[PDB]
Symmetry: C2
Subunit: 148 residues, 2 copies
C-alpha cells in the first residue's frame, strides 16, 4: 500500500487500520503466539484448548475461524493418524501475511519469548500423543518471513 | 504453567488500537509534517475541513489525555489579530507508540505532502508567529 494517493490516504487505508486493530486482541494474540512458539509452528484446536483452559471451545473456534477468514492463519486438513483414537485432522499455521501483520503492530517477536514456557508446560498423555502424531504438517516458515 | 500475561498487556493492546484511527493519525502526521513540529487547532481545522470542530477537538484532547500529544500554552502574539495561544506537539511517548504500530516512518512523506498545501494569508501569518514553540523530534525520538 502507498503512503498517499494525491496527498490523501490511499483507498484501503481504513480497512488496513481495522485489520491491525483486529489482531490486537488478547485471545487472538494468545493463539497466534502459541502457534508460533510451538517448535513445528502448527497446533490443533484440541491443543489450543489445552493451552487456554479458561476459554470455551466455541470462543476459541470463533477466533480461529475469524483469523482464517482474514488470511492470518492457514487451515491445514490432514489425514487421520493411525495410532490414536479420534486424532485431530485439522492443524493451524500462521501465514506469511499473518507474520507481516504481526510485525506491523510489533507483536511478532513477542512469540519467541514464550517458547520455553510452552516447552516446559505439564502435558497429559493425550497431548503428548498429539504432539507426536505422524500427520502433523511440515510448514516452511522460512519462506513465510519468520526469523530463523 | 500454560502462560499468564500481566494486565499491563491488555492495556498496551488498547493503546495501540486507539492510535490506529484515521483522524487521529491525520492529526499526528500533520503535526510531525510541520517543519517546526507544532500546530494550533486553527491550523488543524484548516487541514481537516470535513471534520466538525467539536470532533477534531475531541481527538486532540483524547491524544493529550493519553500523553501522545503535548498541549503548549504560549503568549498572545502582537503581530496578528486573535492569534492562537495554544500549540500542540507529539511527545516522545507518542513517537514510540507510532513506531510500535509502524506509523512513524511515513512522516517524511507527509512533510513533503504538506509543503505543497495551499495556504491562505491567515495560515501563513500563523505559521510565522514569533510565539510558536520550538520542538525537536530528533531529540524526542532518541529519548
Ligand atoms: Cl506514496
Ligand atoms: Cl482438534
Ligand atoms: Cl515484532
Ligand atoms: Cl487555535
Ligand atoms: Cl515506523
Amino acid at each position: 500500500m502507498a503512503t498517499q494517493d494525491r496527498g490523501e490516504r490511499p483507498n484501503g487505508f481504513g480497512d488496513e487500520l481495522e485489520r491491525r486493530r483486529f489482531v490486537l486482541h488478547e485471545t487472538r494474540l494468545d493463539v497466534l503466539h502459541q502457534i508460533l512458539a510451538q517448535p513445528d509452528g502448527v497446533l490443533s484446536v484440541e491443543e489450543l484448548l489445552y493451552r487456554n483452559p479458561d476459554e470455551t471451545e466455541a470462543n476459541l473456534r470463533y477466533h480461529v475461524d475469524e483469523l482464517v477468514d482474514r488470511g492470518i492463519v492457514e487451515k491445514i486438513p490432514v489425514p487421520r493418524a493411525k495410532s490414536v483414537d479420534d486424532p485431530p485432522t485439522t492443524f493451524y499455521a500462521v501465514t506469511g501475511e499473518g507474520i507481516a501483520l504481526l510485525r506491523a503492530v510489533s507483536m511478532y517477536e513477542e512469540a519467541a519469548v514464550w517458547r520455553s514456557v510452552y516447552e516446559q508446560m505439564e502435558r497429559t498423555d493425550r497431548i503428548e500423543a498429539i504432539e507426536n502424531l505422524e500427520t502433523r504438517p511440515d510448514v516452511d516458515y522460512e519462506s513465510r518471513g519468520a526469523t530463523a
